[model samples]
Target: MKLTPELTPFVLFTGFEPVQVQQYIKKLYILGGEVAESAQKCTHLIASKVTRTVKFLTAISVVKHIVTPEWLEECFRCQKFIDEQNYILRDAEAEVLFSFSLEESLKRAHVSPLFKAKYFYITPGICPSLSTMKAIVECAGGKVLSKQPSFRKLMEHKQNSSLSEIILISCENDLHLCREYFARGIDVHNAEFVLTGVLTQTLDYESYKFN
Candidate 1:
C-alpha cells in the first residue's frame, strides 16, 4: 500500500556522502520534493542511517520524524510514505549487550518435547527479526546454530541423530552462504517466513521458499 502525503516530506540528510545526497536530492526532486539545507528548516523529516552525528543529534533533540535513509529511498521508489517502524535506528550498545544473553537462551531452551523437532542455523545480517526467530524456534523445542559450525560439528550431529533440517536467511549480495546451504541440501528462506509462522501459528517449513 502507498501512503500519499498532502505535503511532500521536506527531507534533511546527515552523515551521507555529498554526491550520494545530491543524487538522492535529484531523485526527490523528480518525485515532487526537495531537500532542506538545515534540519530545523526541513520540518517534515530528518533522514539518517546512523545516529550520533552532530546534525543527527541536533535533529533528534527537536524533530518528530527522524528516520533511516531507507525511509526516503523506499518512499521515492514507491512514490509514497512507507511504514517507518522497521527502519528506525536501534541502540547499537543495547543490541551488543543482549547478543550473548539471546544466544544463551537459544542454547538453554533448545529442547521442545511438546512440538516436533526442528534444527535451524541462522546466518548473520537478519537483524531485528533474528531475535524473534531465535525465540520462536527455541520455544518450539528446536536447536539453533549460534555460529558457523564446521562440517565436523554437523557430521557429529548427524551421527548422533540430533540433526534434522538446517535453515538460513538471505544475506545481501552474498551467494556463498546460499551455495553452502544448497550444497549441504539445506534451504535458504526469507526471514518473513519465520515471522509469519510465529504470528499465524501456521508453521509450515515447506511453505517457505529458497531466496
Candidate 2:
C-alpha cells in the first residue's frame, strides 16, 4: 500500500555497513520517510540486511515489522510500502550467517531424520520461493501432499490420515483455514520455521512470528 505521511512508518536500519546504511536512508527520504538512529518509541520498521548481530536480534524483539533492506528499496522504487510479505524476516532467531560448511548436512538426503514418514502440505504463496519449501520437505524426508484440501474439505479428511502438518504463508485471508485446523487439532506453522530448520512454534498462537 502507498505510504502516506499521516500514517508514515518510522524505520530503523540494522545489519548494514556505513555506506549501505546511508544508501537506504536516502531511499527512505525519497519515499517520504526518515530513518531513526535507534529503535525508539516511534519506530515502526526495522530494515535488516544480514542475519547476524545483536542489533538485528534486538530489532526482532522490539519491532513489529523486521524486513530486509530490499523492502525499503522496493518501497522507494514503487513509492509505496509494498506488501511486506515477501520481504519479511519471519524468525530472526532462526537466521544463520557466515556459512562454513554443509558437507555433512548436504551429504545426507534429509536435514531432520525424524521427518521420515511425516506428511506436510504448504500454502500456495510461501515466500523466499515455493521450490525452496519443497526442497526442504523432501530433504527432511517428509512427503508433500499433492492436493491440499480446501477449507470445506479439510475437516472431511480422515483423522489419522497421512497429513499431519500444514504450513501457511499468509493467514490474512485464510483465518478460516487456521481456525479449522485448530479445531481439528492439526499442526500449522509459518514456512520460515521449515525453511530455517527450526520447529519451535505453530500457526495458532505464533502467527505473529511470520508477520
Candidate 3:
C-alpha cells in the first residue's frame, strides 16, 4: 500500500493490516531535544508494554527470563541524548522517565538543567555507566529517588503518560505499527512509537499474541 501523508496517521495507530501493508517502510521522525519529552516518551512505552512488547511462543519458555538484571543495568547506563545541565525547564513535580533505549534517557538527562526532583522513577533496562545515568538525572532537575526501577504510571491512573518524563525519540521506526492500529478503529491517543526510554502515552490494552 502507498502511504501518503493523508493515511499516515491511520497507518500509525494500527500495526498493519493485509490491505494496508506497504511494500516498503520508512524511518521515524523525531521532534525535540528536551529531557521532559524524552522521559515522557519512555515512560509511556514501558507502561504500555501491553501493545508494544508483543508476546512470542517457544517450546522452551524464553518468556520467564526476559527481564534480566544485566539488561536492566544496561538501560540505566546508556547515553543516547546530549548532556547539558540547566538546558531545559525548571524543577517542578516528581518526574518519571523511561525508554526502550536506555541511552536516549541518559542523553535527555545530561542536557537538562534541573537535576533533582521531589520524586523520580525509571523502568527496567539499565546501562553499565552509573555516572552517565546520574548525570542525566542531575541535568533533569531530579535526584536519584531509587536504585530500583518501578512501574508507577502502569497502574490505574487518568493522566497523560508523556508528562511522566522527557521523551527524546517517541516516534521511531514504529510508524507502520501505529498505522495498523489506526485502521483497526483504536483511538490514536494511546498509540506510541517509542518505548520507556522516551516519555510516551501508555496503552492499557492487552498484548497481542499470535497463535
Candidate 4:
C-alpha cells in the first residue's frame, strides 16, 4: 500500500502563515482549513511569539494546542506528524517570566477545567477586553462579569455549588484595586491573576493581590 496520511486538526495562524507547508498540509495532513482568522473552530494554532492576538489568545484562553509554524515544516520534512510537545511555541523566557510551565498548563487543561465553577469580574480597562476574557473563561466552564458584582452574589453562588466561587479582576494601577470585597473574603485579584490562572491552570492569587 502506497497511501499514507490522515486529516490533521483544523489549524489557525497568528502573526505568521504556513504557505511553506500549505499545500502539503492541506493535501496530505490538513484539510478544510479556512481563511477565517479566529479561534472558534481551530484544533491547533501556530505562532512565533506568544503575543496577544485574536487567534492566539482565544486559543490560549480555550486551552487549544498551539505550536510553532516549524511544526508543519518539521512534519513536512519527515513526511509524518511529529510529537507536538517538542515543537510548542519555544517561548522559554515567557514561561518563566510569566511564571507558568506551558507543558504543565496543557496537562492541567486536559486534566480539568481550570476555571470551572469559578466567576470573575474583570474591570473595564484591563486592555484585553471583557468580551475576550469572557470567551476564554466560558470555554472552560467558568463565568465572567464586567461589572462590580455585590459580595452577596459570590456568597450565594458559593452556596449553590461546592466548587463555585467568584473573583474580581483589577490591576495595581486601578484606584480601587483593594476594596471592601477583600474584607468580605472575596478574592480581589488583577488581570494577571486571571491570566496566570488560565495559563498554569492555577489560582496563585498571592502573586497578583494588591494587599
Number of the predicted model whose lDDT against the real structure is largest: 4
Greater lDDT among 2 and 3 belongs to 2
**Cα-based lDDT for every prediction:** 0.55, 0.52, 0.26, 0.66
- Rank the models by lDDT, top first: 4, 1, 2, 3
lDDT of 1 by residue, 1-211 (tens): 3224546566777777899888888777777766766544453344444333445423332344556777778877887666666666544553364332322222332332212465677667664455655655554455677887666666676677655655555545545667765787755666555544432234455666663
Q: For model 4, give the RMSD to the true fold.
A: 4.3
Judged by lDDT against the true structure, how good is candidate 1?
0.55
Q: Write the per-residue lDDT of candidate 2 for residues 114-194, one digit (tens) a residue.
A: 245555676666554456556555535566666666655455444546645434343344455567666666556665455
Q: Kindly give the stretch of ten consecutive residues in candidate 4 with the minimal lDDT sum.
A: 28-37
Tell me the spans in candidate 3 whose CA falls farther than 4 Å from its real position.
1-125, 147-153, 156-211
Q: Name the TM-score of candidate 4.
A: 0.74
Better of 1 and 2 by lDDT: 1
Question: How much does each candidate deviate from the true structure in C-alpha RMSD?
Answer: 16.6, 15.3, 21.8, 4.3
Residue 149 shift from truth in candidate 1, angstroms: 64
Name the weakest run of 10 consecutive residues (lDDT summed) in model 3. Answer: 56-65
lDDT of 4 by residue, 1-211 (tens): 1223233456776775457445534633432333333555666777776665645545664535788877767766766656778778768888877777776776777677778777778877675677767776776668876567776777787777664678777765663655676666666676766666676678787988765
TM-score of each: 0.38, 0.38, 0.19, 0.74
What's the C-alpha lDDT at position 58 in model 1? 31
